[PDB]
Symmetry: D2
Subunit: 384 residues, 4 copies
């Protein structure tokens, strides 16, 4: 399994240190002018300046790279840094982007407010249907951007299918795989060109850092991403890379519990009288199931369910003793949130409708607490 690989990453120890040191430094010394000049031309081994490359950050990069099966990986200050760099490194004025109609709030914001200002045409469309992608296609389409399962509805897209369309028609396929982690979803393995995550979520898993990572199938593309990063300036700080690498050491073990717990909570909720419906990709009733079952080796533990009214949703969210009312996901403890008024509050009403987000929906992120304790907490907030 992946645990051994993550505990035994490639490369040398620094001064025989067992834990890899924190290179809390901005700059690096040169042995000579020639050696420094050589490093700026990409010749020889070594470092220059932490924005171009930091050993502690590179160590975390290598960890993600190996699990993704990439040619390379780039860490950023946030998921949004990885997202904006994995798109604006490639898209320019006159290009067209097709994006999933259902996305994290700030991704909607990026694609909807910023890209069109830079002359980039953007269409949000229902990517759970490959033919809708073929129809939205234009002669200037350079990229398709997917989340799958999507935030917050878990809507599934056919990554393999869309990848074939992209390869045939000369477009990059970019997949935000935050919700599932690289334990269970490896988009590069499905034909995607770029796979990215908010490391703030499962990969770090401890709710104490914000970070992003992007991984590219080709050496050229990862180099472009790092060239953009050098100029856009969204970096992972060395301390944060130390914590992300450290949190990643328990990643495969944490996901196993996340997946089993998310599944059990979802079923509990699904057969409860108070719950209209549960959107979990691992349920036989959920419309994305057959594709998700086939394209993923497991499931994350964040999903959405429907209450009968706003009052009922508020009442449930406000009477949990173990679950915490908070945005974010993928933390070791259970989080709960209300998309309409929180993570997706700023989404234009028209895109809101297309996503199917209403005041009755509540989103949960199941931690690794004992399941029966979290089922019990939900139970008393539902019935009592």
């Amino acid at each position: 399994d992946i645990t051994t690989t993550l505990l035994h990453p490639k490369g040398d120890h620094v001064l025989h240190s067992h834990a890899y040191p924190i290179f809390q430094t901005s700059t690096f010394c040169f042995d000579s002018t020639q050696q420094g000049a050589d490093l700026f031309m990409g010749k020889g081994e070594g470092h220059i300046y932490s924005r171009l490359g930091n050993p502690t950050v590179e160590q975390f990069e290598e960890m993600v790279c190996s699990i993704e099966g990439a040619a390379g990986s780039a860490a950023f200050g946030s998921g949004m840094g990885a997202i904006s760099s994995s798109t604006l490194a490639f898209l320019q004025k006159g290009d067209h982007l097709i994006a999933g109609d259902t996305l994290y709030g700030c991704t909607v914001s990026l694609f909807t407010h910023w890209l069109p200002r830079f002359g980039i045409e953007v269409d949000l469309i229902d990517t759970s249907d490959v033919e809708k992608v073929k129809a939205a296609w234009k002669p200037n389409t350079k990229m398709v951007y997917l989340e799958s399962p999507a935030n917050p509805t878990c809507k599934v897209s056919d990554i393999k299918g869309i990848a074939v369309v992209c390869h045939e028609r000369g477009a990059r396929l970019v997949v935000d795989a935050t919700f599932t982690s690289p334990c269970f979803l490896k988009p590069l393995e499905l034909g995607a060109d770029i796979a990215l995550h908010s490391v703030s979520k499962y990969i770090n898993g401890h709710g104490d850092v914000i970070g992003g990572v992007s991984s590219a199938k080709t050496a050229e593309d990862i180099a472009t991403i790092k060239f953009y990063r050098k100029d856009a300036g969204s970096l992972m700080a060395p301390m944060d890379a130390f914590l992300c690498a450290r949190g990643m050491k328990t990643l495969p073990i944490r996901m196993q519990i996340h997946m089993e717990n998310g599944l059990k909570v979802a079923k509990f909720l699904e057969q409860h009288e108070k719950i209209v419906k549960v959107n979990h990709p691992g349920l036989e009733s959920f419309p994305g199931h057959d594709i998700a079952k086939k394209q993923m080796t497991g499931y994350g533990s964040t999903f959405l369910f429907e209450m009968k009214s706003f009052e009922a949703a508020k009442k449930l969210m406000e009477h949990l003793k173990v679950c915490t009312l908070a945005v974010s996901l993928g933390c070791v403890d259970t989080l709960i949130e209300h998309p309409a008024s929180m993570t997706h509050a700023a989404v234009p009403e028209n895109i809101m409708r297309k996503q199917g987000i209403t005041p009755e929906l509540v989103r949960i992120s199941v931690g690794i607490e004992n399941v029966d304790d979290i089922i019990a907490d939900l139970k008393q907030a539902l019935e009592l």
Copy 2:
């Protein structure tokens, strides 16, 4: 008027659990009391926090410190100076807009303005901003922004910020000034007419060579809100631990800058009179073109400057035989740094731009630290006197 040393040591805000040092909020998310209290914070209603990308208390304390020396309506911290530059430009500029920028800029700003902006349909001209008439001559009906570095990295070329600000204000353009080389102790672009002042905190502000970060300050509440809206989507964030270090570094900014200024001038004068040195580009020297603008618009000088040797081989012999100065890029550190712009910080700048910047293989850039100045001068002197 309370001195700046005092202001930086006593920033406004409540203590947290009576802690003397401001804690490190190494957290991603924040808890809500109720769905209403959370919904409201997302609406901008009420006091509190949601998520560190949107606002982190440790970072916010550092932003308050900066906002207070700058005299701004607000400040935003970033993962790097480049994060601050991207967000202070691309937050306002859009396809069809025109930017006038100084022709002498930090190499990666050159790359940003030259490779990325045009790909986004932004028109860019690099102009000699030391001449206001040339800025006027480059102006177009669609000009939206002027971006300046003064003194410029690495040649110390001085631009008339005041004079340029008048033209921006008459014609509806934002004036954005990168004041990294001088620090906000000595250069306050918002007091000179700029709309935005920004810094690589990586340099003087932090001062200890152990953090990369950026900060941008705006004259107007609206502009700082727009910048932070961009930051939220573009994602260049200062990490809580890095904010804690920069705020800590900043506690000694005024006294460090006083020593930097005085050391830098003494080193420049020593070099200026040395047989081996052809020319010294320090804006505090009377021989420097633009000394008169610099002395009127600033209140001191940073300690990073450029000088000319007789040859490239002479520059290398100097650079490689120092025992106190360290050969490395960056600047504004407590210890003295030295580098060769032509093959290092500015090695990727396109040939025509490098020629217009005046960067040759004979040039050496020094960033003088806070060591005893006699030790620094004796180190340079022994290297210049080598067999």
Copy 3:
């Protein structure tokens, strides 16, 4: 009743500024509202903080977490396991007192008991604590404390904590137990009758090999107050950053221990049936001397144990041709560690005490991590075939 996994993920206490992760109070000192309020806090009156050596909120959060698994009146965090050991013993023992300690202990514990305590006028007898009668026989009118590790470092020798605690209760002596090797998931000494339970946090509790720290937990409020009073003067503090990392590490302690246990047992059994191996000392093996006491007193096992090679040359050959296991001291990390006690962790212990501990150039100690066991066995197997 809430499960321990849930308990560790939901520590008691107020959030600071609504922060989800508990903040790192990297501060030395704290402000007072008024002279009266400062003065009151110095007298233990009212709620609040003064100075991090007396108490730091980040450190106290970690302390609360540990106090909960142990079932203690209170816990104290220190700069190291040795700080915990020194403070848990010398806070109580004074000139003329007598201490009985297990004869097989961590090397620096031996150094502490054998070099420093007798200089402070404290009499120390190291005796075989796996036999309760040898404890009774070694007793004196001035015996104030019994100190144990079980299973012991590095031989895993098991003592009957519960039987020894009865003797201590009867005779007016504190029982102090170093439970580092087992973690508080599996061994809770305060539940067996011990007065104090301590750990090198550097090991399983943190579990990520990147911090050094100690913790001590006491059955009574008066004893933990005494320990903290010693700590105020001796000055072995846990740093706020390290407390943040230990609390964070501890968030996964129960799942990590479960894997450590099952992994360790599988590796012990593989070695027990390999022809190159004379014996395996794992308290969870049916063939191990104190197995019955250990099954009864503990609810699982740590994954650090000792095995015997045929010669020094074979032991060396094994340790130096492993590709996954790392040659290094320490234990309880996420990754597998391996060490040669005779020349490393216990190199400094006097011949005298080494004879009685049964440590020889042929013993190798492994600390099995949470890697896939099949990878650890494959590494071991490959080295044993050269």
Copy 4:
């Protein structure tokens, strides 16, 4: 002779992976090349590391900086000043030995010496060490150590270190000096004859009020080894992150101490001439007993000192109405702190020792920071002139 400022900015030792800032070795253990190479390291042969309790690279960098200003054979870092004091005393003293210590000491040092040492069969007398004759009169055949704090916390009482060192040297006792209040910039006890100089690093050395730590330096390789042998068993360690912060703090130590010294003297003179102030105990004042000794044995003054108000009520009124000084214990921070010894730092000192120490409810201790001195003085003045 290279200045101390330069020396601290340019410490000996190789760079790690060419990193300009020294990395933080947040690790517990270290890998061995072979069983022989590890065996060797346990015997003390070869270069390298084993385990962070025995030695950590980031902590050793901080130790070398301290060793370099002290002039020592080696230094050892601890989790606190109290860890440095414990390990500097109990590593040497054993049952039957006798210690002479100053009668005016930091509260917890009093607790250590009067509560813990006697329990270990060590005999202790607290003596007025400002009188060398009183030290000689308290000497016994078994005296093994004299421990001094000078100027003492909180009364600034001055001991003659040099004169007392002569007696220690003649009679085979170690002289241990706690030099926390003055910093190693201004007081170097190893140059005056001490065997051991120690500090709470939590104060001036780190300077930023965000770390608790201790350091002890010895004149002899054998003594520093014994101190470290004790440390490995007593377990008071400086954490790698804390060592990183202390080393970074120490980079500005000389300039910070220069401002502390000047500010502190100016505040003392202001208070000394103020109608509301009865007496000022600053060892830099001509009116202070022991000024002549302090001026001869130190090359400057710390900025923490004590003054006497007309009453407890007057003291409380002053302490509670300041806006730039912060009411809190500790000292040597960049910002100004103020404290009431009688009910705070020394509230736990036995009545007899407190009468000997001279501590009354009328005394206020101020630790003067690096704020502009006019701002600090104006803040004191407005509080002293309250309705």
